[PDB]
Every structure is written in C-alpha cells, then in structure tokens.
Write an enzyme that holds these catalytic residues in place. Structure first.
Site, PDB file in Angstrom:
ATOM      1  CG  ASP A 264      -2.185   0.969   0.990  1.00  0.00           C
ATOM      2  OD1 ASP A 264      -2.651   1.148  -0.171  1.00  0.00           O
ATOM      3  OD2 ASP A 264      -2.639   1.537   2.010  1.00  0.00           O
TER       4      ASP A 264
ATOM      5  CE  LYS B  82      -3.038   5.113   0.697  1.00  0.00           C
ATOM      6  NZ  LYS B  82      -4.478   4.804   0.469  1.00  0.00           N
TER       7      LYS B  82
ATOM      8  CG  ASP C  67      -0.963   4.103   7.224  1.00  0.00           C
ATOM      9  OD1 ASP C  67      -0.420   4.907   8.029  1.00  0.00           O
ATOM     10  OD2 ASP C  67      -2.199   4.024   7.077  1.00  0.00           O
TER      11      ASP C  67
HETATM   12  C1  B49 Z   1      -4.159  19.635  12.399  1.00  0.00           C
HETATM   13  C2  B49 Z   1      -5.343  18.727  11.799  1.00  0.00           C
HETATM   14  N1  B49 Z   1      -5.139  17.570  10.758  1.00  0.00           N
HETATM   15  C3  B49 Z   1      -6.087  16.220  10.677  1.00  0.00           C
HETATM   16  C4  B49 Z   1      -6.755  15.410  11.817  1.00  0.00           C
HETATM   17  C5  B49 Z   1      -3.644  17.388  10.612  1.00  0.00           C
HETATM   18  C6  B49 Z   1      -3.033  16.885   9.316  1.00  0.00           C
HETATM   19  N2  B49 Z   1      -2.142  15.907   9.736  1.00  0.00           N
HETATM   20  C7  B49 Z   1      -0.919  16.144  10.209  1.00  0.00           C
HETATM   21  O1  B49 Z   1      -0.513  17.261  10.337  1.00  0.00           O
HETATM   22  C8  B49 Z   1      -0.195  14.951  10.601  1.00  0.00           C
HETATM   23  C9  B49 Z   1       1.000  15.027  11.442  1.00  0.00           C
HETATM   24  C10 B49 Z   1       1.706  16.211  12.004  1.00  0.00           C
HETATM   25  N3  B49 Z   1       1.386  13.792  11.661  1.00  0.00           N
HETATM   26  C11 B49 Z   1       0.572  12.908  11.071  1.00  0.00           C
HETATM   27  C12 B49 Z   1       0.643  11.348  11.204  1.00  0.00           C
HETATM   28  C13 B49 Z   1       1.555  10.592  11.948  1.00  0.00           C
HETATM   29  C14 B49 Z   1       2.690  10.954  12.760  1.00  0.00           C
HETATM   30  O2  B49 Z   1       3.084  12.059  12.885  1.00  0.00           O
HETATM   31  N4  B49 Z   1       3.330   9.863  13.344  1.00  0.00           N
HETATM   32  C15 B49 Z   1       2.565   8.739  12.897  1.00  0.00           C
HETATM   33  C16 B49 Z   1       2.700   7.243  13.157  1.00  0.00           C
HETATM   34  C17 B49 Z   1       1.784   6.401  12.627  1.00  0.00           C
HETATM   35  C18 B49 Z   1       0.710   6.918  11.750  1.00  0.00           C
HETATM   36  F1  B49 Z   1      -0.085   6.088  11.252  1.00  0.00           F
HETATM   37  C19 B49 Z   1       0.550   8.285  11.463  1.00  0.00           C
HETATM   38  C20 B49 Z   1       1.483   9.193  12.041  1.00  0.00           C
HETATM   39  C21 B49 Z   1      -0.435  13.601  10.326  1.00  0.00           C
HETATM   40  C22 B49 Z   1      -1.503  12.826   9.540  1.00  0.00           C
END
Ligand code: B49
Ligand code: B49
Ligand code: B49
Ligand code: B49
Lengths: 284, 284, 281, 281
Positions: B144, B146, B162
């Site tokens: 997966d 992407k 993921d």
């Molecule tokens: C601010 C509101 N938004 C949506 C809910 C934010 C957009 N998203 C963001 O900024 C964002 C940030 C700052 N980190 C992640 C994801 C992960 C991370 O950091 N360690 C992980 C370990 C495992 C996993 F599976 C995902 C993450 C996102 C999606």
C-alpha cells in the site's frame, strides 16, 4: 429541430405541468394534465444545455437523446414498457410526455416492503422478462435494468423505463461500452471493459441484471456488494453470491434455480428471456 | 498479554495524549507528550472492539494487528521507516507510540506545492526505495505504498508508514489478495484477481507503486485515472500512461526513463529497488 | 400575469439558455445568450408552482424586489435587471452575467483575503450601500453570497429579496436576513412590540461582519448552536483571535469595531465608513 | 479529580468496552459489559482547546449534570447513571443500554409513527416530565434525540446537559435547548431584560413539538432560513398539512394545540396533559 420558443409554446399550451415526482442531473419529471381532456400524464423535461460541456460533448448528448427517442417510438405500444405519448423537441430542451405511473419506482416500493413475496415477485418478473423478450426480438438491448428503472401503477402493473443506455444490436454483433449500474453489470461487461481481448457482450447482459433484480426483490439486499467497489468486481466476475440462511430460509428451491440460471457467468450457458419465461417458477 | 485496565494505566501514566492529527475506522492518531520529559510523539489508539463483528471476524482483526506490530518491531531502527517506540497491548485495545512527523503526509505536501522539483523528488525517492529495498531484503512486502502512507518531518526527511496490508513473503512465494489503493495497484494484482490460472504477485508490486508515486510527485496528478474506477483498471493492466506536453515539458529524460522502468507491466522486466537505486537519476 | 406558454415563448424567443451557474429553493440561475446581439447574461428562473393566497404573497414579494431593482439599475456596483417575464407559474429575471460568481466561493478558494483586496471590495460595497440608503432603500441581506464578481474582480450587490423602502425618520420591524449578519436592534425589536424598530444602520453592521469574515476567513459570531450566536450578536462579543488577526492592521480593526457597534446611533454610516483612514489611498 | 491513568484503570477494570453506538462533538457512546456479571451497559466517554477558566466551566457543568442524574436515578422512564469515573482529560459515565437507540433514528426508519405507538411514548415522556417537575427540575432539552428506546419500545429520558433545579415561584432566563423545540417565552426574555423569565412549562411546549414530529415525521416550526423559524415559534405558527395529517385524529390534534400554546399560563402541565382523552385508553 423546432425553435426553443415553439417547443415551449406547444407544450405549455397543450399541457399543464403539476407536482415534481422525480429529478435527474439535467431533467425533472412532473405530473401534467392535458388541458383539452383533463387526462393525466408524466412529463420528463430534459435541459440539454444545463451542463457546461464542449461542443463535441454536447453533440454526443444530442445524438444519444435522438437514439433514445427513436427506440421509445419503436417500443411504444407494449403493455409493460413506458409509452412515449408526445414529444416537443428543440435545440435546448426536450419535453417527453409519458404514462403516469402512480406507484412510482419499484425501488421505493421495495424499500417500503423491505422484501417481496414470491407471488408478487413472479408477477413483476414475468412482466419484466416479457418486456426484455420483446426488446430482444426487436434487436434492442436495455443495458440498465434495475428496480429504479421499473415503474408501477395502482394495479401493481410494471412498465420498464429509462432507455438512456439502450441500443440496437444486430444478431451476431457484440458491444463494448461500459454503461449501467455496477451492482447490476454482467461479468462479461467487466471482463470486457478491463480486458480489450475479451470478445464483447450481447443481449444476455439484460438477463444477468434480471437475475440481480429477482435476487434483490426477494432478499431485500443485492447478491453482490462490498464497502470497496473493486472487491465487488471480483464477486461479480466469479459469480460469488449466496442464499444466506436468515432471509433465504423459506424461499422456494424453484426461484433459487431461476436465480442460479440467470446469475450464470457464461453468457452462452445463461437463460434467454424466452427460456426464463418457460421456467417452472412462472407455472405458478 | 495485559488486562485492559493495565494497558490503559501504563499508557496514560507515561503519556499525555494531545490533539488528533489523524482518524481511521477503528483508530485515531494523536500527538502525545512523554509526561516526565515533555518530549513529543504520535500515538495510534486501535479500538479492536469499536465495530460490531462476529467472533471469527474479531479474531481476524486481532491476528491482523499482531502481524502488523511484529513487522513494525522488525523494521524499527531504519531511518526511513516509522519507528514503533512503545506499545501497550490488551484484548480491547492497542496503544502504539511512534515518531511524531510534524510536516504530516507527503500527499498533503504535494497538494500544497501542486508538483515537486526533481531535486526534492530525488531526495524522497532515494529514501523511499532504500526503505523498500530494506523491507524486501527482510522478506516483507508493504502492499500500500502511496503519498498518504509517507510521512515528513521538519527536515523534509521521509518515513514509510501504514503497514496494515504488509506481510511476510518467503522468497519465491506468491500472493493473490487484492488490497491496496486502486491507483497504485500493479497490473499483476488485477490480472490474477480476474484470471485464477495467473501465478500471482510478489514484491515487484511495491515497485510499480513507487513508479506511480514518482510520476504523481512530478506531474501533480496520477498516471492512471478515470471518473469510472473500472476504466482506470484497464489503463493499469495495459500500462497506458503519457508524459503530457504542458506538465512534462521541462522534466528530464532521465526521470521519464526511471518512471518507464518502474511502470513496466511485466514484473520480471520491472526494476528491483536495488536496480532503481543504481539508475542514473540517483547520481549525486 | 400572461399564460405560462406566453412568458416562456417571449423569454426563449429572445434568449438562448445555457449552463446552470446557481440554484435556489424555488429557482435556478443560468447563463443565457440574447439571440439578436449574442451578448451573454444570467437568468434567474423562479418556479411559483414548485395555497393560491400564499402563491400571490410570493408573486407580490417578487414584484417588490423587481421594482427596487429597476430603481437601482445603472449603478456600477449593483446588479442590473436587464429584462423580466411574468406568468402564473414562472418569473424570468435577466441580469448581468458575473463570471467570477459569488464573493463567498472566492473567499472559500483564497481562505482569507489581503487588506489591499479587502479595501477594494469594501470601498465598492460601502459606495453601493451609501447609494441604496440615499435612495431610501435598506438591503437587509448583505453577505458574501449576495456579492457577485466579474473577471476584473469588480463587485455587484445582488439578492434584493429582503430589500425595502424606508422613508427617513421611519423604522422597520420585520425579522429577515441571515442570522450571522443580523444587527442587535433587529433581534431586540423582533420580541418587544414596544421597541421602536430598526433602520438603514443594520446594513452597516452586516458590512462590519463581511469585512471581518473576508480578513479572518470565518465569521465574528459563530457556534454550533444558533441560539448562542444570538447572545454574542446582541452583546457585540467578537474577538481578533491571535493566529488569523496577527498580521492585520490596527486601522482595519478600528474600522470593524466602529461598524460592529451595538448602538445604531454610535455606529458608522456608509459615508462615514468611506471617510475612515482605511480607505485613504 | 483522579489522574488519567486511575479513571481509565477503574473503568476498564470493571467494564469491557464494546462497539461504538453513538458519537458527539467531545464524546463517544459505546456498549460495554460489566465483567463480573456479563450484563450490558452503555458508556459515554467525554474528552476535552479552551482557556483554564472555560475548561473549569465545562467541568462544573458536567458535575451539575451528574448531580441531577443521581437524584433521578431509579425512575423507570429516565436514564440511569450506573457509574462514573472522572480525570483531568476524561469522564466515563455508565448508563442503561437502550438497544433500540434514539427515538429520532427510530422515527427516521419508520418515517412517521402511529397514534397507538405515539400515545405509549407520550404517556411515559409526560410521566418522566411530571416526576422531574415534582422534584423541581427542568430538563430544557426534550427532543427525539434525547429519548432512548429499549426492545420493548419502552422509553428513558436522557441528555440532562441543560437541566437545572428550579425553586418553585422562581424563573429562568438562560437561552439553551434546541431552537426548533424552544418555547416562545425563552425567545421573548432572551432579548428583553424586563420580561419575567420562564419555568417548567417550556418542557411541555417541547413535548408538544415532539408529539407533532412523531406523527408528521417533520417538526412544526421549520424553515430553509433559521431566522424565519424563530418568528414561526414566537407566533405559534404551525399547520396540520393535508398529505401527512390526513389520517390523524382530531383528539391528538387537540392535545398538540393545548401543548403548543404560546401563553405558558394557558399551556397544559404534564399532569394536565396526562388527563387528556388521548391517554384515557
Ligand atoms: C491539524 C489537523 N489535521 C487532521 C486530523 C492534521 C493533518 N495531519 C498532520 O498534520 C499529521 C501530522 C503532524 N502527523 C501525522 C501522522 C503521523 C505521525 O506524525 N506519526 C505517525 C505514526 C503512525 C501513523 F499512522 C501516522 C502518524 C499527520 C496525519
Ligand atoms: C412524495 C412521495 N414519493 C416517495 C419516494 C415520490 C417519488 N416518486 C413518485 O412517487 C413517482 C411517481 C408517481 N411517478 C414517478 C415516475 C414516472 C412516471 O410516473 N412516468 C414516468 C415516465 C418516464 C420517467 F422517466 C419517469 C416516470 C415517480 C418517480
Ligand atoms: C452551479 C455550478 N457551479 C459551482 C461552484 C457554478 C458556480 N457559479 C458561478 O460560477 C456563478 C457565476 C459565474 N455567476 C453566478 C451568479 C449570477 C451571475 O453571474 N449574475 C447574477 C444575477 C443575479 C443572481 F441572482 C445571480 C447571478 C454564479 C453563482
Ligand atoms: C454508529 C451509530 N448508529 C446510527 C443510525 C447507531 C444507532 N444508535 C444505536 O445503535 C444506539 C444504541 C443501541 N444505543 C444508543 C445510545 C445510548 C444507550 O443505549 N444508552 C445510553 C445512555 C446515555 C446516552 F447519552 C446514550 C445512550 C445509540 C446511539
């Protein structure tokens, strides 16, 4: 070919449009009254230029609606096919006057009743297969049979509608265009649209859709479905469906045999509409 | 394994969960602070019993998450793979503590920038292919890959994440399971999900996905797309894509060669991660 | 008025209908071409068939609207009613075609606007409001959804559905307009039948709300529960929240404040707002 | 109160959390099993960006709610608070599991209910309201979303987030509750400080709105524009529209009209409503 003012004038002078009974992307279906007689009909008002499209894309829409109205005139008269009573056609719009089917779509009836009896399903399927047999004898493939495209009257009599995907098919010739609702698509349409080497499909695709309709009317749910559409495509292509114990418990083996013979992956091994009609399911 | 109260106690005693940075069906990803130091991480809280499921399906979910955490422990340490720092495992839930990737998903970065430079794409692709080479050397297939599963830190350094679809693949062994994002699926995954006689797929599927990622980062749009998902599948299986004149104009022939060698329909003729890393596009 | 076939014939004989650019409850807005000249316009088709007394109430209200539109037709920052066709069922209203659509959709795309761009929009808006008021018309529904843009980013005030005439010294009482844009005196009046009513000052409170929203990208009085929003309006409780109001001048904050004034007597008129140091160029 | 690990430990040690059956803004509702007995319940897990003052407001309000819930625990048609666990970031509230969910979702499925099934729901809803009022509690948020059903189609009144104790003779002024269910006197005194306030009669106006909605499948005061909905409420302007009210008794139409009475003094009490010939048999 009429100017827009003429089609509008001729329609509104002869007909009184009433309540909205259906809606589409570039169309609305309304009940209407023929002013001179007081008799009731349904009018589909197609707004040909309502969507922003290229001049090529627009002529495709115009040619397709011409194909549809031509087919509708051929099959007008059949007791279980929607009748095109009148038409007012211009460049910008189309006023299509039909039979008023007061109990609406079979889909909404199925939602209300949840699941139908074999007695009521027999009556609907017989009428449907008779309409399909007629279309086929006249070398027309519907290509979008589903409960949403089957209309009912107060006497619970069905009339097949929505010929937007219909086309003529010369005996011996095959089609390739992907059209119709995914859950109702025959395996050969999918095989065909994913693999160019696949020979194509014919009138048998309507009978697979009949099989899907028959299953859905009795179960109250479709034979093939998944949260993810791509996983639904293998269940269709492998013909993977089941007569699940809670809802299929008291259903006759006779109707299960009919579904099995309609839900046949091989189009050559699949029942024709005439064959399906001589099935013991319809011998009461 | 721990009683639910112990996993919850141990997690909430050591960590302070903060803002939600991601959502899933039966999970949430939150920023969390290690109480004693004030240092920040990301916690994925998997709610194993959040969905109503049969006892068999629920053990499928439990076995699935065990497969994932086992793979995550094997790969912890690699600079371009997400690090599982800590875990609290009970019957009902799983608290998985990881690296906090402050610039989020590569997908959201691509949306903001529209399309990336070959300099920035080179840096991301090198790190990605190094991670893929490591996984495959350890007999793991991601399944997966992407931009949504590639995370970025403030230094623009990537970490593959993921691993929900990942699995061990003993060398020479083949898979058939259809899972993974349709746009990124290799032709052999589709071909064998419609032709039972087809031998199956291997680790080469991750490299097709790398080819799709590489194309998308530069073009700002995927190589295979259609309104109808089924017609996109036909394009994938025939390997029908193009370097369209407006967006591919000033892009080097070197990267178009790399893309061509990754988006190779024959898995045997397709580059391996080690082969892709030796391609002149990665010359320093 | 005319039979349905006649209004439809007269409209479609003179105009060629094109793509749908907007939709309402009982209406659709389409681009149309004037057949004889080839000039493009926008047509609002109101379907008054989708009680006979209530239907004549809707007809009388649309007559009130078209009358006001004909009075203001000609102003560069007000929508022009080019033509109109009436039957029992239909109403065909031909207007200027504003090719960049609603200011609301532009704001969604840009998230928040610059003071430079906001200055240009606000000047035009307040000039249109000043004109309306000089002609003793109160718009009563000023919001980004009712402000249209052309390709030159030039503004035209539209949707005069709640507009009415107001003789000077006299007051209004009807509760209408969008809740987020309602002045405190409208809410106060709607309840107390002894309350004296409201005037043209309600348009300038809405201008204050528009100005805030263009810069912040969010409205000043907002929440999940509409009833709590009413309390905020009536107390004039808005804040210049630190993340989005950081890079904003004190000059525009002074303007917002002076428009978002609970006392209608203490609130800036359109002519007063136009003389604010924010509009000195 | 407790550290987060303690509230979580105490809850998860006693109860085994299951599937999510409901979601809110700052909460989730899950089915849970009491480990020692195997008996099923529902747990509402409330979790926390707000100022330290606003955060203590959200805490104090939830304490007000749990206090009221402990006073009412035991009534057959009121939700039972079985258990509670509190920390800085969480509140675990254990309740009865109502297997047929919210009356609102049941109404969506059935579209409109029968007079037989409505009489059964309305009897129990009035009995619960009569009990609350006898104990000097005003619910202030009665609606189908706050009425829960079991498999026997038996109701339990829930969501006491707006509930307060009211000393007899004394009056309230806070604007709270769902707009469509608000009595006219709540709207009148929110805007006019000289208005005397409202009492327990506001719950019976809401009962009238519930009764209408169960039978019609739509609320009595509704409008595309929310501000026109408020005018409808205050004037008590509703109608028994011919398609859906066709096959409905005049008896139930009478009780609705006696509950949807603008004057709170002229409006039916819960005990009075229970003596109407609609509940006789
Ligand atoms: C601010 C509101 N938004 C949506 C809910 C934010 C957009 N998203 C963001 O900024 C964002 C940030 C700052 N980190 C992640 C994801 C992960 C991370 O950091 N360690 C992980 C370990 C495992 C996993 F599976 C995902 C993450 C996102 C999606
Ligand atoms: C208000 C209650 N209903 C609940 C779903 C409304 C939905 N719809 C209804 O009842 C309904 C009725 C009464 N007729 C039709 C449709 C058609 C008809 O009659 N002749 C046609 C000819 C061509 C066509 F393309 C459609 C129709 C519907 C959808
Ligand atoms: C419907 C599909 N689209 C979704 C964003 C189209 C977006 N809409 C657009 O672009 C748009 C455009 C280009 N013009 C208008 C509206 C009007 C116009 O131009 N003169 C008027 C005079 C009176 C009136 F009451 C509306 C309009 C919209 C909404
Ligand atoms: C995923 C959501 N679905 C929407 C159609 C499920 C529908 N709803 C359901 O299943 C459902 C069921 C079976 N119970 C509840 C709620 C409560 C319950 O039982 N005791 C309570 C005590 C307090 C409270 F505040 C809520 C509940 C829902 C929402």
């Amino acid at each position: 070919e009429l100017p827009d003012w003429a089609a509008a004038k001729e329609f509104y002078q002869k007909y009184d449009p009433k309540d909205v009974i259906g809606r589409g992307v570039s169309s609305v279906v309304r009940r209407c009254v023929h002013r001179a007689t007081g008799h009731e009909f349904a009018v589909k008002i197609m707004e040909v230029t309502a969507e922003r499209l290229s001049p090529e894309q627009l002529e495709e829409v115009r040619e397709a609606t011409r194909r549809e109205t031509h087919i509708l005139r051929q099959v007008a008269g059949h007791p279980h096919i929607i009748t095109l009573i009148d038409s007012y056609e211009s460049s910008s719009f189309m006023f299509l006057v039909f039979d008023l089917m007061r109990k609406g779509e079979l889909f909404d009836y199925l939602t209300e009743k949840v699941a139908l009896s074999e007695k009521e399903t027999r009556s609907i399927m017989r009428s449907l297969l008779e309409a399909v047999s007629f279309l086929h004898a006249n070398n027309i493939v519907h290509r979008d049979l589903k409960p949403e495209n089957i209309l009912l009257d107060d006497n619970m009599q069905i009339r097949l509608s929505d010929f937007g995907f219909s086309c003529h098919l010369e005996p011996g010739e095959k089609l390739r265009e992907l059209c119709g609702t995914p859950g109702y698509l025959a395996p050969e349409i999918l095989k065909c649209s994913m693999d160019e080497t696949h020979p194509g499909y014919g009138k048998e695709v309507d009978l697979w859709a009949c099989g899907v309709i028959l299953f859905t009317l009795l179960a109250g749910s479709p034979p093939f479905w998944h949260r993810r559409q791509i996983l639904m495509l293998r269940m269709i292509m492998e013909g993977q469906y089941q007569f699940s114990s809670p809802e299929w418990d008291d259903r006759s083996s006779t109707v299960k045999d009919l579904i099995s013979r309609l839900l046949q992956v091989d189009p050559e091994a699949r029942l024709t509409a005439e064959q399906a009609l001589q099935h013991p399911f319809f011998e009461r």
